[PDB]
Structure formats: C-alpha cells, structure tokens
C-alpha cells in the first residue's frame, strides 16, 4: 500500500452523495450545474429532458415540486437553484459538501 495515507478510522473509502436532477437546457438548471462545477466536488446529474417518469421520481423525492433543478446532498433535499446559490452566499455550501 505504497502512499501517504491518511488514517482516523475511516474503513471503506466513501464520500458526499451530490445529486441534480435537470433538463438540459432549462437556464436555472444550467445555473446550478456552473456552480457544482466551479466547486469542483464530483456529482451525479440526472437529466430527464422528455422524461415524465423520471420527473415523478423526483417529485416523490422533492416534496413533490416538479421545478427544475432539484438537488440532494447525501440524500437530504437543499431545494433548487435559488437554493444553493443562497446557501453559498451564506457561506453555508462548502460545509455541506463536506467542504
């Protein structure tokens, strides 16, 4: 296990659950993924242009809402667009993403 290692009994390597889901091409979607990007975290975007299942899938998950985007950090709901921009702003994001 040649490296430097960092140890405090972490066990099994896992990390911040980052979840969008999106269209494309929707311009509050868009916003949302720049910042996710500028932050540089690893993130999974759903994006469901056309899809109706898909959306009802999220809205079962997003209190109902079917606005777009709608993201979740390690499964908790943080809302939309306005959302996350409002918790940076805060300087509230960077914890949430673990930093």
């Known amino acids: 296990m040649r490296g430097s290692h960092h140890h405090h009994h972490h066990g099994s390597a896992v ?5 969008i889901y999106t269209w494309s ?10 910042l996710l990007k500028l932050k540089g975290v690893e993130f999974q975007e759903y994006c469901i242009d056309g899809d109706n ?10 209190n109902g809402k ?10 908790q709901h943080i809302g939309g667009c306005d959302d996350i921009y409002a918790l940076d702003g805060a300087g509230k994001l960077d914890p949430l993403l673990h930093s």
């Open 15 to 19: 990390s911040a659950k980052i979840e």
């Open 25 to 34: 091409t929707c311009p509050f979607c868009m916003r949302a993924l720049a």
């Open 53 to 62: 299942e898909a959306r009802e899938a999220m809205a079962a998950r997003a």
């Open 66 to 75: 079917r606005s777009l985007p709608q993201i979740f950090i390690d499964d």
